[PDB]
Amino acid sequence: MSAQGDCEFLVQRARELVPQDLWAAKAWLITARSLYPADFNIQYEMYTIERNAERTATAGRLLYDMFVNFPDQPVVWREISIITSALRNDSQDKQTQFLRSLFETLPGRVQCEMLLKVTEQCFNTLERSEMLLLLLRRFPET
């Protein structure tokens, strides 16, 4: 019922809204409602467009909640892998620190589940073992 086209039009509007004030882009992105859970990747991209501490905190809350709601987007897995690698090393990136803070902000059970999912995805022995060790260090009860 022309739902992909609406998402494409919203994406074009956001692309045109990058040059203008971010408040207008945020207001346009907020009132969509038609397919917001399906277009939550676009919402994640918009939240990652802003890089403020408050914006990153809101992103780390909302996008993580949506990813828990919709655990089928590979973008969520990519973000989880980036957050885990940011926790492991590469602290010089402020956005990496924001992702690490967002990951640590989640509950211990949720963080353990995300780390277990990453380790299951991590077919490599070294990466899976390092992720499991990091999860055990952060969460001793897991």
Add this chain to the structure above:
Amino acid sequence: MSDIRHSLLRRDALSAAKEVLYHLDIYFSSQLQSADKGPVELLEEFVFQVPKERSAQPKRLNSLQELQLLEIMCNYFQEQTKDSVRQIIFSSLFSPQGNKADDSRMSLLGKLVSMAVAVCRIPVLECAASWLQRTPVVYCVRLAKALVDDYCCLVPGSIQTLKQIFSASPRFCCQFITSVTALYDLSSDDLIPPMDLLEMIVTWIFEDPRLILITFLNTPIAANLPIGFLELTPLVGLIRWCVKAPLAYKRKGVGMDRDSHLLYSKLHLSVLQVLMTLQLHLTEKNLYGRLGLILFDHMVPLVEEINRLADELNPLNASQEIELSLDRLAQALQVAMASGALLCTRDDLRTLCSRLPHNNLLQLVIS
């Protein structure tokens, strides 16, 4: 007795007026638990520099004595420490009583309110806000427009003082937002908001949802008051102001005002936070009764005003602006529908879109 009135009918800076006001306030406070028009009218006329006799000379004109009386009244009101007494005095002072100086008395009351705001008389400012809530939107909005024109047009700092007061008093901020929305009705060139006032409004959009929520939670709302008793949510005014960005050029040479689109759009973007806060306050909580929010069936009047005002060369000169305004109106309608502010079903505004310029945003609103 009339002897006290005669003793208080001399000089324009006399403290006898303040003593009489304090005695009347004390009598009203004493009798409030067990609870006059004439005494309040006489006190206002004495303050308004109109004598007791209906057709006599003015009460000693103004000069510096009027300033001394105003300063004494401000000092008493700030230290009055009585919300009900201050509210009653403020309501009596700025009410239309039919005297020869009624408009001047209302203007002087607005001047004293501006002085109190500059003096940071927070309880007196709250009493004035309640009195404005107990006053017609016409006279109160005119007084607010006069005070805004007085302060904003001066040197920078008045906007800063207004923003500081808005941060301090949220009820006064909500009343000011409603008054500014009523003044900036997009009716004429004067309806275009001034630069300083718009800058203060845009800067004060960090707690606008919080101020709206505070105004809503301040007191339960009864049925529709006479022509508006300072309604908290002026969403229609902000939505129109965002839409009226090219209307600044349209109303005017032609291109006198065209740079205000971005600032209005930034201020309009706060409505998303306001919409989410209103949804949480009404749908999530037990406040889902009544019509959701303050609508008053004004959406149809807003659509009609948008259709009527946009006729000034909408086709090619302002095609992009018209389409953007249509998108903003669609976003406002979607926010109202999702947040429950507009309890009415479809075709209340979809039919109104027939007499508006065709855009993809019209189809999106319909969809």
